[PDB]
């Protein structure tokens with residue numbers, strides 16, 4: 102049966118070091134956007150092909166954002182959270198002020214919208 106978003110997330114997580122890193126959140130974003138555009142199969146194929154060519158899994162994930170057309174010139178998704186503390190420890194130092202026109206294929210993984218109005222971009 103078809104690969105699900107959760108299955109793909111787990112496959113990608115299996116290749117990443119650490120826990121709750123910016124790359125883990127990029128997996129989340131790739132899987133959610135991929136699910137919503139019925140593109141999980143090509144995303145998985147690009148991931149596996151990059152690994153097969155010898156790329157690191159980090160590089161494979163970035164290549165997805167540049168080579169799978171749903172991500173080309175796409176803005177990062179907005180994720181609503183309560184406070185900065187909801188964001189995983191390993192992501193904290195990757196949080197930045199949000200620039201004008203952030204793009205996933207330029208390393209802006211997602212934008213966190215905090216409950217008090219603050220906004221932070223997650224950068225790789």
Ligand SMILES: O=C(O)c1cccc(N2C(=O)C(O)=C(C(=O)c3cccc(C(F)(F)F)c3)[C@@H]2c2cccc(C(F)(F)F)c2)c1
Pocket residue numbers: 106107126129130131132133134136178179180182187188189211
């Ligand atoms: O319902 C699905 O089919 C599905 C598929 C793939 C991913 C997820 N997600 C989650 O279940 C989830 O917890 C999402 C995380 O990105 C997330 C969601 C909230 C807070 C945080 C934080 F810990 F980084 F702060 C992370 C994540 C997610 C949900 C909504 C939107 C995104 C997106 F904005 F694309 F990054 C990600 C859901």
